[PDB]
Amino acid sequence: AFNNNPSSVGAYSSGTYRNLAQEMGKTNIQQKVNSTFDNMFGYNNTQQLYYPYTENGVYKAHYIKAINPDEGDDIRTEGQSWGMTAAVMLNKQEEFDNLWRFAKAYQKNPDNHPDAKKQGVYAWKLKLNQNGFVYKVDEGPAPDGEEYFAFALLNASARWGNSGEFNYYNDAITMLNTIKNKLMENQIIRFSPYIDNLTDPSYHIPAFYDYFANNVTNQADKNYWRQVATKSRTLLKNHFTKVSGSPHWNLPTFLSRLDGSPVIGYIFNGQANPGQWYEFNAWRVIMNVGLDAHLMGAQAWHKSAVNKALGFLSYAKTNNSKNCYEQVYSYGGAQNRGCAGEGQKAANAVALLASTNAGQANEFFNEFWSLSQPTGDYRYYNGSLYMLAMLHVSGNFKFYNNTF
Template identity: 30%
Template sequence: MAQSQPPQGAFFTGSYPNLLSEWGLSDEEIHTRIDQAWHMLFYGSDHTQRVYYPVGDDMAYILDVNNGDVRSEGMSYGMMIAVQMDRQEEFNRLWNWAKTYMYRADGPYAGYFSWQNAPDGSIMDSNSAPDGETWMVTALFFAAARWGNGEGIYDYEAEANAILHAMLHKNEQNTNVVNMFHPEHRMVVFVPAIGAISQFTDPSYHTPHFYELWARWAAQDNAFWAEAAQVSREFWRLTAHPETGLMPNYAHFTGEPRPWGDYGEFFYADAWRCAMNVALDYTWFAADPWQVEQTDRLLTFFHNLGIGQYNSRFRIDGEPVNPQHRATGLIAMNAAAALASSSDIRWDFIEEFWNTPIPTGQYRYYDGLLYFMALLQLSVNFRIYSPALSWLMFSVLK
């Protein structure tokens, strides 16, 4: 099969690889699977399939079924899936719930979102997890492009810019809450609070492909976002193991694994997402050829373990750690990585992904959302929507 990557990124060419089609699936097969994922995860059985739960006439939340809570991560992923699927009602419901219950309008956390709430909306942890804000901002920009800006909280572009401002200017308020990006290292922090918790990073929080968009679209701090994109690409080179390609859940700003909690220094659930982020950055911007080498290295490591056999938790040198059940989320992320691979082994990961059922049951939240995003990315249905172009279009229509 031919190499799938364009010589320039999709941001410049408008051309997105469709690996599922290249592998041999028909458009009907692909769209049927996407429709199945949508209906199961958003409107399936309350007890075994769905993660999206409507509340009243105008709200909804994404439930972490295994933990029984609502997380900014899941809300932001739900928003991104909704905007990619052109589902404005579901997007608005999720955004309304997040703004009503997770958003902090005042106090030290003003402008941030709590990372963990109960399904009744009550805050369980006041801290913020920057990946939630990161994906929300980008989903809001895409919403502005797809549907135009409305009023109040539905002025998507204004809301995105307000979050970006808070992410970089919290230090000016002299509180115990700090910027989401370290002012010296120019990297996203693990948790934006004074102390050790903001003195290291999570490699899976790094999304240079989003920062590149913010550098072009944000109302301010554009030079910072352009620099942050390059810093994150360089950081990935430091933190990825040179032989396995594995990255840790958490890392020092210098790249070394950072112990924190039970699995901070290991390749585990957070770190599964690094493969997707590297592949998306390459697909959209093709700014760093190393990302192809990195992806091939990572997929070779798992391929050598055996398709259908590798588990989900390792030291970054490849040593298994308390081997766990095989996780659909990791299968999905390895398949998404194929977007940046130059090796024919990528098709084995595509095949494994396609033959893996849409997640149901206890772990359907994380596994299911990662599965859905990989499905969209591999089928040319995860795209950049530019609010700048949308503004021009709406001006012409008026």
């Protein structure tokens, strides 16, 4: 049965990881997790997201392919870092190393870039040119990519050691220093180096910062990361207070000010969507709240955030002609951008680690567990989130501390 009373003591402290799928009465859980990885990382061109990169017939590295029928396939730091995270959780070292080799060689902006704000950050969008060779489309970062790279590398160090191709630990500390020096404003993760008073709630993963604090050696840096953790929980608490009731109707938004206020409308040239939309990025917020509750303990704010958001989506489904909740809402109104696909259902299943409503849990968990693994033209984002969720709901998303 679903545990509707999640502990205030996290798995990171206790060592006790929940297996949500087992609580929900499912069978062949580990088999399904393993097949999900094998299909995503297999050469089947069906579920596959992991592809080799060669130059003049010489093997170089691997990437997660952001398949895109509208604008041409590209390669993103979020997908790359999420792939590495999946690989370390399942002890898949070659896959990890092949992805990290690609990131460090081809995504990393040089440390002596003429723009100091780009030095050592990871270019969010690459493509292969007409002759098949990789190039940077946009050098600007997507800072949750760096966050997941640092997380994944610290875990690789802890599981595998640092004497092979990579000194994972040194690579992780370098990544942490880059985040602190290039991607933070007053200890809150940035949306952009070039815009102040701006964050993306989906980039806030408080438990990662607590993990960082426990994996750096010096006192000042331990305190720094513990403060980022506390400030991140404050940002999310404040954002969830601000989106409660009218006018945002309990869903978090794409962009926020540093006090948690949703950004209204457009604020910069190049912005993809209005700031107050619950859209593709915002899907991840309650996934992150579930992660935090599981790993670091559930408090009243985690439970309220997820219960009210899932409550809104359930309500929105009852008021939809297609009998689905949709991918994009603004001020509680459906924006006609399609029924929820696999990745949104996946994010919402992870959120259940902070839920106190067994009925909600049944509905949202079964809607996720009944899905086939993503295929076709939209499988990059759907399939990436599906993989992460499979780990989180099977007790496989764990923190592996380094020893000093």
